[PDB]
Amino acid sequence: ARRRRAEVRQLQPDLVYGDVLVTAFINKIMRDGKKNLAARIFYDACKIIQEKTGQEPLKVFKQAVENVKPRMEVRSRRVGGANYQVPMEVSPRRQQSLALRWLVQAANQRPERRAAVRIAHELMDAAEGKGGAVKKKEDVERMAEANRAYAHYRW
Amino acid sequence: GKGDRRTRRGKIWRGTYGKYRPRK
Amino acid sequence: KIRIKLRGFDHKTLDASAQKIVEAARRSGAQVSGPIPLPTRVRRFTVIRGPFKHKDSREHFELRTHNRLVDIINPNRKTIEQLMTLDLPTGVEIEIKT
Amino acid sequence: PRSLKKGVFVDDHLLEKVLELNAKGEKRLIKTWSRRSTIVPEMVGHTIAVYNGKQHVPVYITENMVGHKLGEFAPTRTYR
Amino acid sequence: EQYYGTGRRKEAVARVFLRPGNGKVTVNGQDFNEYFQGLVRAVAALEPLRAVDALGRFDAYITVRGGGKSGQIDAIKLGIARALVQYNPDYRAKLKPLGFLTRDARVVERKKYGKHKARRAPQYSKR
Amino acid sequence: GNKIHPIGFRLGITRDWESRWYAGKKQYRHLLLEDQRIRGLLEKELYSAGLARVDIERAADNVAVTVHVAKPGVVIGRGGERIRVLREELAKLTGKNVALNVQEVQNPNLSAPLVAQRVAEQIERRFAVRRAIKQAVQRVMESGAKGAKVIVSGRIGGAEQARTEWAAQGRVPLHTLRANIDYGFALARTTYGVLGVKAYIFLGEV
Amino acid sequence: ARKALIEKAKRTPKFKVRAYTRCVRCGRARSVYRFFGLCRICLRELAHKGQLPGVRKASW
Amino acid sequence: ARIAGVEIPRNKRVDVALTYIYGIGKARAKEALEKTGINPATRVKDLTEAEVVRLREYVENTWKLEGELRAEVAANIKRLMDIGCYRGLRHRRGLPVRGQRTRTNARTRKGPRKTVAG
RNA sequence: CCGGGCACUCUAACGGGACUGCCCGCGAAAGCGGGAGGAAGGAGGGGACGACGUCUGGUCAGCAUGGCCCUUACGGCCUGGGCGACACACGUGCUACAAUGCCCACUACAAAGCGAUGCCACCCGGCAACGGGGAGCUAAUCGCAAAAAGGUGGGCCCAGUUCGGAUUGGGGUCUGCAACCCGACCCCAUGAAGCCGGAAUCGCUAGUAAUCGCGGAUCAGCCAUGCCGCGGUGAAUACG
Ligand SMILES: [Zn+2]
């Protein structure tokens, strides 16, 4: 991005819920190219909440995920002494993706054999403020602020 | 797994025929 | 009724090299089978430029034997004469069958 | 592991001057380089002068030492 | 009574015949849900006939063959999105914003020397 | 080197191959064997007339030496004299027997290769290294040429100092894969180390 | 490569298991293409004009 | 359940539960459920009394195993020793035998990396 | 499939289409914001092409080529041996550590190439590599080939495990004068390390990375996981 600020890729509206950001999630499980399996993988961890519960995973991903979405983070920074950590108001598109870059990561970490489970079972704990991901997100929302000791370099 | 000479992808990798790798 | 194959080296040489072997017989044997295309097959060699090391630059080399067809439909000796040994082309060769 | 099939091969440099030798209690240490000839039974008594690419080496053959090829016992290069 | 709508994509021919009233697909046999095995991404070819409401009102005969199925659902897609205007060159309103009318540029690249994957360059150690 | 060879770069674009025969396969490997067995001499002994292009005709058994030669006369020979003393060497190989036919070359000062060996003979001459080159670039230049370039290399005057001396004029656009050009290369075995020279010639263009 | 080895341009080895191709001109052994019976080098500089009819600088 | 020479496929599908003998691999594994005809699936925890006996009886008699097999091999090697055949020569120094380079690699038949200096 | 018919695919061969021209805002202008319509853009995407010169970069084992030097030999000829060692260390990769996985059974879409004692449909002996006999092709119209991933059903249940296949014993097919030194391949057995890798560190901005599978050349068969290409499925992200 040294010449042009670049431009964001946009996608199709899930052949299901009718949303695309989820296309991403469904693709954040996508691994190796086989979104085929991953297609369902997500989908099922839904009808396994319509099999394991009776509330369509709409506010789950929603109200939950957006929580796993870091309201603020820390970064490096060099001057005359070193690369001092800096607290700064996170981005949207960043905060955003990190929702999933964290779901699918600490979500496949949870030991529940089949992809599906870990999936459903994660959105779960997520849509409750508990379990895997939310730590990191917080872990850092917490990291930042905890490092509020740095602001001389504001940004 | 790819060297399991005696498996599908085994003879399907090395690219050969044997007991496990049939004709049809 | 008169199969005429002719692979080649040039696209409209060959193409034309027989395109003279067409419409005459479209008023002699009855008609023709038209200037028949036919998918062309190729060869390649891409090799290491200059000996020793380097490699990575081989440079590519094609070569096409463009198989072409035009087949005159139905003889008639009028056909056999209407584009008989009534030849002309050089860059191409021909296979005669029926 | 190993394989010959229908028509095992014994070099007729030794196998040849082997059949003849035998006729008196076998010869007395053949000299044919041939270290690529299947070891054969009747020999069992001889001694082989097989090459080493520089050297010729002793090999009093046996029937047990048969399913072999003269120099599988003829160690080429040199180690420690 | 009859209309048309061809379709190519990523290398996959696929004319989308259509004699309205409904729209039962018949790709090389296997009715719609048999050729492309209910893979989430196959309910996308007819996607165009879904923002026009024709869907259950425009019968069609879909056949196709040319490389790989992931694309075919897109190849065919063209005509099933092409039909609604072929005969109805009016339907270009609830057509455009969806670009189901636009061709699919995306294609495949090709391996040049000093490479592994048409771009995937090897590696070196210390430098 | 960081260049190619426009001749190669320029084939189906403006320099149609020297050889013509088709088919190939069980064939090709020989047709281009003998083909390259006639060059051993042919356009070598007869270079003293036009060692330019050595075009070949064919159709199997239908050999030919459409060979182009500037000096249309150290050949043909009074109605057909050399055009035989050599058919008798044309068929000293060709079991197909060719229809040999010397070709009338125009201003040699437009025939790159010609110049190459030219300035080359004119380089074995020790005679005006560069000056000749300055001449060359011009001859060729004024003799119609729209561009002209010559490039001797490796040792000069026996310079124990290997070097490459430039020289061209008008305009010599290569990259313009189209405008058509022309090239040529020769040599010069020396009492100090064989070297060689190029020879380029842009022209009408298109 | 040199002329101390043209005992194959003939093809008469001694067995069906001996035929070091030898490139027409290059004459070396290491790359003797078949379709042209010469060398990978030969392929380049020659085809580089009209010494490989039917050829061309391959691109696509 | 002890089938072959001191062996015990327990709670694990008889099929492979047999490849638990220095003489059985998934090849002979089925050639058992054959001349034996036993329902291959169903764990051993369901294996009848005369069934265990048959393969027991068909396997112990049909192939040379464990003790016998093990030490039989000890011989071949023990063989290639006395006999100058290279094969022996290699088991002699504890290094590859059928056809490998030995500049590098072969860490398994040569043992754990023994570094030096140069 | 036998007619029957080019409207459709593709076939190789021509030419048409895009230029910031139209749309409207900034500006002196280039042109930049966005839109119109367009199959498409603001150089559609990918190549082929690498300036005057640079390090005396690389090769005289391609050949050539100035000269130095041995010449019953610092040519050669043949069999044999070596280039393939090995206490080790580096480079690039293959395979895998697995359950988004491995395995079996039934079914489907690749494009580009390739084949005359040369690829080889089939019937049939063998568990098998392969053998014996044989249909069409001179190759859009026969075949090498079957694509695999994947879809469907089902076997495994978190195990150094039906993961993974090193290594090793034994029998055996094959080219071939000959596979001990060193040939691939197939069958049985054996089944090793490896539960994702210290510091450090390599690739890619899209149909690319990733994953899957196909052919090619040299080539008797072959140490190819290499190389040169095709294509199937198809991301992430770039504040600055
Ligand atoms: Zn050569």
Short mmCIF file of all heavy atoms in Angstrom, two decimals, chain G residues 23 25-26 39 42, chain I residues 62, ligand 1:
data_model
loop_
_atom_site.label_atom_id
_atom_site.label_comp_id
_atom_site.label_asym_id
_atom_site.label_seq_id
_atom_site.Cartn_x
_atom_site.Cartn_y
_atom_site.Cartn_z
N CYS G 23 24.59 -35.03 -29.85
CA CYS G 23 23.94 -33.97 -30.60
C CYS G 23 24.62 -33.69 -31.93
O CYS G 23 25.82 -33.45 -31.97
CB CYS G 23 23.95 -32.69 -29.78
SG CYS G 23 23.96 -31.24 -30.81
N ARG G 25 25.48 -31.32 -34.01
CA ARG G 25 26.58 -30.36 -33.93
C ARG G 25 27.21 -30.33 -32.54
O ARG G 25 28.38 -30.69 -32.39
CB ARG G 25 26.08 -28.96 -34.32
CG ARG G 25 24.90 -28.44 -33.50
CD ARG G 25 24.67 -26.95 -33.72
NE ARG G 25 24.02 -26.67 -35.00
CZ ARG G 25 24.11 -25.51 -35.64
NH1 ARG G 25 24.84 -24.52 -35.12
NH2 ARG G 25 23.48 -25.34 -36.79
N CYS G 26 26.45 -29.90 -31.52
CA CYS G 26 26.95 -29.85 -30.16
C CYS G 26 27.76 -31.12 -30.05
O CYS G 26 28.94 -31.08 -29.69
CB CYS G 26 25.80 -29.87 -29.16
SG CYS G 26 26.18 -30.53 -27.56
N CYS G 39 21.08 -30.49 -30.00
CA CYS G 39 21.18 -30.09 -28.60
C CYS G 39 20.21 -28.98 -28.21
O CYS G 39 19.73 -28.24 -29.07
CB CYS G 39 22.60 -29.64 -28.29
SG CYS G 39 22.77 -28.85 -26.70
N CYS G 42 21.36 -25.98 -29.64
CA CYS G 42 21.03 -26.02 -31.05
C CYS G 42 19.59 -25.57 -31.24
O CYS G 42 19.28 -24.74 -32.10
CB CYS G 42 21.21 -27.44 -31.58
SG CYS G 42 22.81 -28.10 -31.17
P G I 62 31.49 -26.71 -21.03
OP1 G I 62 31.10 -25.32 -21.34
OP2 G I 62 30.63 -27.51 -20.13
"O5'" G I 62 31.59 -27.43 -22.45
"C5'" G I 62 30.96 -28.71 -22.67
"C4'" G I 62 30.54 -28.86 -24.13
"O4'" G I 62 29.41 -28.01 -24.42
"C3'" G I 62 31.56 -28.52 -25.21
"O3'" G I 62 32.50 -29.58 -25.43
"C2'" G I 62 30.67 -28.28 -26.43
"O2'" G I 62 30.35 -29.46 -27.14
"C1'" G I 62 29.39 -27.73 -25.81
N9 G I 62 29.22 -26.30 -26.02
C8 G I 62 29.76 -25.28 -25.28
N7 G I 62 29.46 -24.10 -25.75
C5 G I 62 28.66 -24.36 -26.85
C6 G I 62 28.04 -23.47 -27.77
O6 G I 62 28.09 -22.24 -27.80
N1 G I 62 27.32 -24.16 -28.74
C2 G I 62 27.21 -25.52 -28.81
N2 G I 62 26.45 -26.00 -29.81
N3 G I 62 27.79 -26.36 -27.97
C4 G I 62 28.49 -25.71 -27.02
ZN ZN J 1 24.70 -28.56 -30.21
#
